[PDB]
Write a protein that binds this ligand. Structure first.
Ligand SMILES: N[C@@H](CC(=O)O)C(=O)O
Ligand SMILES: N[C@@H](CC(=O)O)C(=O)O
Ligand SMILES: [Mg+2]
Ligand SMILES: [Mg+2]
Ligand SMILES: [Mg+2]
Lengths: 496, 499
């Protein structure tokens, strides 16, 4: 058979081509910024890093390409990609065409259906439209059940799992059959996740592995070693808790460019606020910052800030309020001044905002602390004038980028700290799609030991029953997904 | 101390600028401060950098108005300003002036075909003027001396003054004639407006600086003299007054290392025939067609300008395009005052073929373009034809869809040129273009060499467009980059100045 390895081909070419799935949630799927993410993609990344160390090629490139259940094996055999980790069952029939790593997940094949409907088990599918994803194990099982039991099902074959779920969600099928965890994943992305139930006696139990070409023991050994190390280091259980037991967030990217004319910077970015009906409210941000002082600043090369925030409520606070936890890291440039020295400890923060939106006047006061070493903010905001006339999430970006974590190799690009203590003016236009606009002007500076953000906000042209003045936005940030899925006994055994 | 002493101490020169003195010192639609006088301001800054041996001197532009320019100069809030300030004896008591950079007369702007033919026609009428200007003094003086009973509306800056006139809330706007021509150029309908009236005065503009600083005055006067005799002053006049003024677009690029590619985002503003603007938000992702190594960039941007024209011998629906693109956003380092194989494919002139098939709200169409690209100069020249008859969308909405491998990457940035590095195998370019209050284009293109020709083959799908919106309604001007075209003669006094 083969005398060489895909590892030798990778080393020659300088790139590893990795297949990935498009809608295997939360394992290998596109997030709303088209990043390929998930539990299996974490294994894929670990394997890629293991290939880089094994080949001593620290600058190896990666090229992720999309595959489907239908085309994964033909594209593997003709060399279109080198391996994939996503949601592929290891079985005997497939071992005739491909090789598999050791198992990374174990599932059972079940049904997703509307809560409170007639579908309790597979027997309820008689004479009904049932959706299943083309090219999958469940498609084979569902057709076989339909034929062997003469159930008169109308089996709809959809191109990928999100399409299958949206067939169910729109009423064109009474149930979706698939791996139970993938049903839970599509449910998490639904308009109303809590309307959907997993039901039915399992038709099978399956084990997922990474797929690679046959006759490559060196590459499979590197994968199996990597999987073994992920387990015994505790990372496998930590990745499970990450994807299945905590909110899954999508980072925002604040794109920064120098504005040398003004000795400052500009930025642009988009926020997508979740709407209660399952849609999204786009908020387009334009930003300009100029230093208050007339001394030197750091004028950055282009880069971006990667941001995630968590909103919560203080159970002992009766005023209208928001508790905020925020994490920000600078990126976009590949690998002590006075201003930067001001941020080496924990710095108290004060925020004051005076707002007028469509004539509705309000004020907000916030206090907390920031830890730029860790890119971390913790703040509590109160509406001091009574009820806030807009949703708290629409004010998050307005309510101190000097607390971003700049990596050591990027510290010469940190405009925000360099303007301290005298500070900077931050101005934004925030354009809400199909609705009004906020215009903001803030001064961010030190007053004594405290970092103060004092803002004026003016909002115009809002729709009184739109998503903002109508209070139709969910109290969250970064478009969370929250899985509802039990750690099974089989998975517990896998982790030993 | 002196102004240079302050600049040297701080490492920053603080430059006052006007906000609406068109086309001398004004904000363009990307908030950049531009104009004929700002070209002088930049020349002065560069002379200060050279004099102080501080190539990394920083610049801080701060806005000033006709009302606050002198007090902010006096208390040191800024160091100098080049804009539109008259030099006169009264102001010399408060400030020093450079040698003259422009000469104007004070006149009126009014609606073409109206009753305002000269200053006498203003009797009993509303007249607008900018607060704190020479014209405001002259207009009030004329009012009282000739008992004209004008209602003088005093607006905060020249754009506000003009929009008072444009919106019918005054019958005329008095100002420096060239500033009237500048505000006209930005109007909803520039050709509706006429400059009339016997000049009330002739004025000379200079750059303002603090009094009793002869060395800083000499640096500015020396720079202004060099601009004249080097011919730059006449070239700047031609640039600002006899050629279209464009705004550049910035294409903001970030790496997408997962896909061995890049993403980009940027905004295009299309001029609408009624004077409004149609926003087109661009999201972009590129991936290499080949599986071999590429250049993965740090964040940077492409600075783009385009000129659309018509071929007078072409009877088909068509667009002639000239485009210039330069990469920017990574500073040339103090210590430095081919990176891919594909880069070598662009050292000379490369022929280009573009093929687009479109479907917008069910209206199908095809476009074919041919021309050539010169990446050494960041320059493209193409002619496009609609091969299916009439184009069902405006040509400007297709410009961004219809080869960023022809961008000029400065030498210090060549390691960030993903586009050329993916050749000859090429790349896939996908976009979502969202037209504000209207529909969306989704595009997928392959850009690659086919033999010696760089080929861009595109599929475009448009949905949710309004049939009477700006796109399907064909309400967009045939231009790009939001041009302004001055209508202003070179006077004999300006010719004298250029000697
Ligand atoms: N695990 C199933 C479904 C999938 O791949 O998404 C299969 O291997 O066919
Ligand atoms: N040139 C006039 C108007 C202006 O400054 O814009 C003045 O000096 O007041
Ligand atoms: Mg939801
Ligand atoms: Mg009199
Ligand atoms: Mg126009």
């Amino acid at each position: 058979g083969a005398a060489g390895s895909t590892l030798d081909k990778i080393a020659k070419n300088g790139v590893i081509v990795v297949g990935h799935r498009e809608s295997s949630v939360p394992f290998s799927y596109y997030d709303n910024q088209q990043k390929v993410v998930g539990f299996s993609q974490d294994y894929s990344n670990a394997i890629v890093e293991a290939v880089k160390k094994k080949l001593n090629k620290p600058d190896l490139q990666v090229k992720l390409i999309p595959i489907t259940a239908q085309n994964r094996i033909p594209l593997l055999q003709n060399g279109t990609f080198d391996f994939e980790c996503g949601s592929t069952d290891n079985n005997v029939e497939r071992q005739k065409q491909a090789a598999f790593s050791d198992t990374i997940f174990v599932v059972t094949t079940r049904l997703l259906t509307k809560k409170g409907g007639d579908i309790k088990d597979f027997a309820n599918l008689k004479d009904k439209a049932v959706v299943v994803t083309s090219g999958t194990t469940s498609e084979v099982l569902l057709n076989k059940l339909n034929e062997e039991q003469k159930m008169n099902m109308r089996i709809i074959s959809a191109k990928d799992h999100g399409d299958s779920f949206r067939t169910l969600e729109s009423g064109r099928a009474v149930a979706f059959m698939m791996d139970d965890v993938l049903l839970a994943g599509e449910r998490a992305r639904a308009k109303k996740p809590d309307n959907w139930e997993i039901v039915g006696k399992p038709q099978s139990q399956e084990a997922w592995g990474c797929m690679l070409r046959k006759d490559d023991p060196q590459f499979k050994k590197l994968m199996d070693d990597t999987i073994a190390q992920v387990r015994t280091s505790g990372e496998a259980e930590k990745w499970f808790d990450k994807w299945f037991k905590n909110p899954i967030l999508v980072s925002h990217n604040v794109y920064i460019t120098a504005d040398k004319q003004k000795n400052g910077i500009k930025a642009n970015f988009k926020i997508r606020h979740n709407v209660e009906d399952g849609s999204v409210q786009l908020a387009d941000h334009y930003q300009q910052n100029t230093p208050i002082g007339d001394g030197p600043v750091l004028l950055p090369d282009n880069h971006y800030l990667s941001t995630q925030s968590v909103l919560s409520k203080d159970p002992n606070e009766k005023r209208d309020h928001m508790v905020l936890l925020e994490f920000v890291t600078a990126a976009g440039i590949t690998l002590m001044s006075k201003g930067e020295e001001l941020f080496t400890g924990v710095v108290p923060i004060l925020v004051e905002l005076d707002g007028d939106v469509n004539g509705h006047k309000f004020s907000v006061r916030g206090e907390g602390e920031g830890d730029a070493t860790n890119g971390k903010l913790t703040l509590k905001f109160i509406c001091t004038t009574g009820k806030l006339p807009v949703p708290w999430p629409t004010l998050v970006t307005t309510l101190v980028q000097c607390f971003s974590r700049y990596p050591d190799h990027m510290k010469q690009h940190d405009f925000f700290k360099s303007a301290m203590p005298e500070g900077y003016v931050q101005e934004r236009t925030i354009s809400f799609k199909d609705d009004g606009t906020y215009k903001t002007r803030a001064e961010v500076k030190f007053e004594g030991d405290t970092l103060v953000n004092r803002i004026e906000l003016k909002g115009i042209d809002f729709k009184e029953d739109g998503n903002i003045l109508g209070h139709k936005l969910e109290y969250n940030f970064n478009n969370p997904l929250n899985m509802n899925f039990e750690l099974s006994d089989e998975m517990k055994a896998l982790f030993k």
